[PDB]
């Protein structure tokens, strides 16, 4: 089995910081940070340039849910998020094509509500890498060591910024499992695409 | 250079046939088909099972512009519609991440509105395909022959419907290429993920 992980994303409840400047409206009325609706109360939040983006988690679980490494049940999917929550993603997760059903769904999640499918714990980075025991790493960066995709089939543990902008930033000595930087491209390419990559590269 | 094509697309104005069932809401303020919203109206609508799912052309279209491959300007992208009009898509367009931005900005290109990087045209897809002289056509369906990704390479054109439900069929006496049936899986995925796999083929 593989670990995909996409780390430090941009998928959170809205900090308590910034609730006073948001409100719930028709046009958007999910407690999720989005800065296509809450881009000026976000003004003062540190790192608010990596923040407020479900939709590059969508898309990149949309790709990876339907892989065929995941059909093969090869996969497993965790969502770490900026404030420190770990989404355990099941294989066999039906993910609403909708963005507003994907916030709904992740609303209730975030907010401790059972799902079945998605399983919500407080848990850094660090710590989820040492439970799963991980030992070879990928930390996927374009700032890495070009790789062609052929060689991702030698780690057991891959992690993705589910992010738009910034460098992944992790504490290796925390970490029990050997880290290795990694590009695919000399380009920057969103979380998405890198998490497709990947997956077929797993595959062919 | 190559050619992409995701063809008999669910990505349509309103049919005029239904728009007497259509009551307009504030929620969803788009001339665009969409099951999601649409789904009482469309009962009787012909074909109605793979028509209305303009976000399947969002999700392939986020993933084909942002591939290797076309970052390297050696794709040529098409979307063919249901009703037969055609978009070139420039390889430089920056696509909206946001679903309703994106139907913004199809709405206006659908209706004829002017927009430098997607041109639009109305074109059958036999017709397309003979118009930039495809040669070696992959019609992509998990009906077709079981062929391992790196073996893509060898055609030029690749076909990937535009739809959930569905086969993808041409008038062969209608195209001078040759037209190949291609599976890449012995399940049904997602027509996003068909158009990674495809890219990444080509890039890798
Ligand atoms: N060229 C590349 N090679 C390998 N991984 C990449 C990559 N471009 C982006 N990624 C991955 O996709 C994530 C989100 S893209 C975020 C910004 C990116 N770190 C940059 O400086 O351009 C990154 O955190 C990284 O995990
Ligand atoms: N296993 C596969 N191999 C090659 N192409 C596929 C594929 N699965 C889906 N596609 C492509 O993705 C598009 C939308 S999926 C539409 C339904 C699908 N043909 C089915 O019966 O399961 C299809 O038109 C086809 O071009």
Do not use: Q
């Not at 949309?62 to 065929?68: G, Y």
């Not at 991980?134 to 700032?143: E, S």
């Amino acid at each position: 089995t593989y670990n995909i992980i996409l780390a430090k994303s941009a998928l959170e409840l809205i900090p308590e910081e910034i609730k006073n400047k948001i409100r719930k409206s028709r046009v958007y009325k999910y407690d999720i940070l989005d800065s296509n609706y809450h881009y000026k109360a976000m003004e003062k939040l540190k790192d608010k340039e990596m923040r407020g983006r479900p939709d590059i988690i969508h898309i990149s679980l949309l790709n990876i849910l339907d892989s065929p490494i995941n059909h093969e049940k090869k996969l497993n999917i965790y969502i770490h998020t900026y404030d420190d929550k770990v989404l355990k993603i099941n294989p066999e997760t039906r993910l609403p094509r909708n963005y507003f059903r994907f916030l709904g769904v992740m609303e209730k999640v975030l907010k401790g509500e059972r799902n079945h499918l998605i399983k919500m714990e407080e848990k850094t980075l660090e710590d989820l890498l040492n439970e799963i025991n991980a030992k070879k790493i990928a930390i996927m960066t374009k700032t890495g060591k070009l790789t062609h995709p052929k060689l991702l089939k030698e780690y057991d543990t891959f992690i993705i910024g589910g992010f738009p902008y910034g460098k992944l930033k992790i504490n290796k000595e925390k970490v029990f499992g050997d880290i290795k930087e990694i590009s695919i491209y000399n380009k920057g390419l969103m979380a998405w695409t890198v998490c497709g990559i990947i997956c077929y590269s797993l595959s062919f």
